Amino acid sequence: LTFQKEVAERLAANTGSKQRSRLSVMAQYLCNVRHIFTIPGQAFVPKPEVDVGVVHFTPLIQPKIEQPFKLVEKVVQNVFQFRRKYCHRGLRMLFPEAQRLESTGRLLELADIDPTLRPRQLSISHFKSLCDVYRKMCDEDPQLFAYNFREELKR
Amino acid sequence: LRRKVQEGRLRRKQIKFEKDLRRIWLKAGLKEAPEGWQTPKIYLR
Amino acid sequence: PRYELALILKAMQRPETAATLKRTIEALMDRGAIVRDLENLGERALPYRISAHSQQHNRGGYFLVDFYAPTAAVESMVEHLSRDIDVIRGNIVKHPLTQELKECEGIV
């Protein structure tokens, strides 16, 4: 598939890269993703002001996270919402305020994750651990997976 | 991958620093390092 | 230095106003001040409604206290004026007479 150059780079970005983001984790925990080559905008007949990358996806035999897609999506989005901060600042936003501080600590201890790790420095195994522990917490709390902190801030 | 390369380079820098420090006291005649001396790790936080 | 305290006091009867003025001047003296004069500008409607000490005021008595105090006194005095319940608003300024009236030759 063809994407914009930046989107293709983010899809195929390694840990620590300036383009490491939600799309990187989401695509790479399920597929082998390769950004093959880039086509400049001058090669398209109405010339755009952006470059175009070509990305190849090969589904993995063993997905790197054995969890439901929406759970991983929520975890990755909340991790990357504050991209330049410590990862725990994004992780605490997964829980209601009353148990925010305690639940974040429990999650980080059970997942064995250094709180000072930034989102761009998290590998797919860290996300696997966090997603497993969050799945356990959701199973032990039926209303947790549907929590939206913005709606709680509306009130 | 640049993290692995960079940390390997930092390790090699620390090794070079230790080697130079050792060279000095070996040339000075001391068989071992100065009594109680321990080379600090200055290239790692 | 020489200071001027502009005091807007609650609209009270004469005895209470006298007591408040005595208390304020005594606080000034206790903080090391030498009071030069006390001018009464009159009781008048405030330019706007002022809320102080959980009370709304539309009228007030305006007074001026000229005095000399050490520089350290001013801050302390301000705190005292914040606590006096009979003071709507107290402000200490450098006395305008100390400010020099520089002379000019006109429009260049």
Place this chain on the structure above:
Amino acid sequence: AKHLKFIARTVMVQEGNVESAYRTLNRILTMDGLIEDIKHRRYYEKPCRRRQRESYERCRRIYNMEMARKINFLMRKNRADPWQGC
């Protein structure tokens, strides 16, 4: 809010001429700068844009006054030709 009402921005009607009173109030608000303030406060103007606008307006006013002064000064010569023919 803490001020007395019916003193600021208040106009009395003369002989039931409500339109004239409204137009006088509009003039007062315009020359006091309140209309332009209200209209400019609807959206935030960035400080750099605000500074550029004020500089442009000031220099436009200065240039226009200088041009008007020049035209008025040179208007005196615009009369009938006293040496017609030669």
Place this chain on the structure above:
Amino acid sequence: REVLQLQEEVKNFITRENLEARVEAALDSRKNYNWAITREGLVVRP
């Protein structure tokens, strides 16, 4: 000259001895700081 002016002026300062009398005298007095200016630069007192 400044010293002598201050020496004569201090005689009228408020002290702890004359506080009450001066307070009452001020209460029975009014001072006006208001005055207006004309286009010709002339002070018009109230």
Place this chain on the structure above:
Amino acid sequence: DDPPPSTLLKDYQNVPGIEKVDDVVKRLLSLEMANKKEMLKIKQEQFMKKIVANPEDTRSLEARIIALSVKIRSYEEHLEKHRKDKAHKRYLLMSIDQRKKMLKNLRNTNYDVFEKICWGLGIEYTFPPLYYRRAHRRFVTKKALCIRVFQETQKLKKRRR
């Protein structure tokens, strides 16, 4: 130490009959009822009387050093309370550098006055470093090790002889 608050202002200290006035006038004409700058003026006058040969000559290098030292003390007193005042930190640092330059000139020209100034103002003249280079971690550790290695070499040589 600061002048006592009862001391008179510099401009009202030689008026004839200033000692024959009321206590209230004395208070009004004392440092107690003034700002800090008059106290600094009194400090400068005291230092001039104690140090310089001609206290009236404010034009000499020693007088300038005294005035700048008083100003430096004022800036230090300000910065003790105002720790985040970067402008006054800059003023203090520039003033210290300028005083060092004046002290260097005084040392080069008049050594006796230089000694008298250094004693009177409690100034410890220091010679500038010869080289200006960063003392980074590697250099610091290496220099420490070299000093130590010299020490054990000295001990070993003493044992040998």
Place this chain on the structure above:
RNA sequence: AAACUCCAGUUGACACAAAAUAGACUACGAAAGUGGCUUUAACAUAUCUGAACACACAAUAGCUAAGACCCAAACUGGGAUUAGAUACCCCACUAUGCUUAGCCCUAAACCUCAACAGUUAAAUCAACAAAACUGCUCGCCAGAACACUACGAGCCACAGCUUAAAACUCAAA
């Protein structure tokens, strides 16, 4: 259209937010910056020049700890829209904008004019910009690209900042 109807209008009480008009002024500060009121401290140097690294500062953005939260608002949701819609409009709400103690050290950080001293006589003067020059000092530059890059080194910075090349290639830029 969604949204709200614990909504809306008048009246009263009521900020850790931002400071109409003055300002058509052109001031203060080394620069960055600084425009609500009062008070206290307070704006170095009586030769000049003098640093990527020494010593102290540096808008906005960004990061640690704590706090405040009206309004604004990267992102994140929802409403409306062609025929692959509006990225753009509407609603809600984050980081952030604020305070305290620390980092980070970047700008079209620009008057795109290095600091001091002097001249207005010369042919004024490639052009444009902003009239043309002189003395003296420091800094910097010697074709383009590779390259605000690689390596080395330093840094509370960890795909960050400063310093900064070579090979191959071209007759230009």
